[PDB]
Symmetry: C2
Subunit: 135 residues, 2 copies
């Protein structure tokens, strides 16, 4: 489904082809700092650049997945994760991505990329993934 020019842009962004599509994770610490779901202003600006880079090569569909580590209440973490993905979705909408083409999901603790017994692994698990499907 994606053209070579689109793949080249995604690779330049640091995205990697996974079973859900081309995926780029960003730290929650970087995106939100001490906030809950309000983005830090520099992070909003970074996200707008990503959205505009995608839109400039007609990538106009994305899936945004929020994730946490396993510390804390499961239901809270799921709600938090969904609201954090939604904050990223709001930036993509404001940049010009059609709202109907944005899928937003909060996975809470259910899909780790790292081991939850380390600070560093818990850290890597607190993230919002930007996913461009490859179909």
């Amino acid at each position: 489904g994606l053209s070579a020019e689109q793949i080249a842009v995604l690779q330049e962004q640091g995205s990697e082809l996974r079973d859900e599509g081309w995926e780029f994770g960003m730290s929650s610490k970087v995106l939100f700092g001490n906030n809950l779901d309000r983005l830090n202003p520099d992070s909003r600006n970074t996200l707008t650049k990503i959205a505009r880079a995608l839109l400039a090569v007609d990538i106009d569909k994305v899936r945004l997945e929020g994730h946490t580590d396993n510390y804390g209440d499961e239901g809270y973490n799921q709600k938090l994760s969904e609201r954090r993905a939604e904050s990223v979705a709001a930036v993509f909408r404001e940049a010009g991505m059609p709202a109907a083409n944005i899928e937003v999901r909060g996975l809470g603790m259910s899909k780790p990329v790292a081991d939850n017994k380390t600070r560093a692994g818990r850290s890597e698990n607190r993230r919002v993934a930007i996913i461009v499907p490859a179909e």
Copy 2:
């Protein structure tokens, strides 16, 4: 004033480093077709992609110059050229480029890049130049 990352985006657009900065020309026949200053819808989308490409690498300041060939009245061609640059500016604003960072100029027939004796040359002169000062 521009990083390599920014220069690379400009090169990909076809920009060359000229007098006023990094410049590429978009054909008026492509942008406007048979219209006066109304952009063709496909051409609006093309310009939005260009604006977003520049914005994605923090190029948020441009100069837009309208140009005509030597066919018709000097003053009308100047006015036409200014309105055509302004239509492009409106697309750039809608894409998110700050309005205060966009300079719009109509140069009319005054700064040709090709010989106006030829249909091909006249067309090369009917253009909107997109310039990123360095």
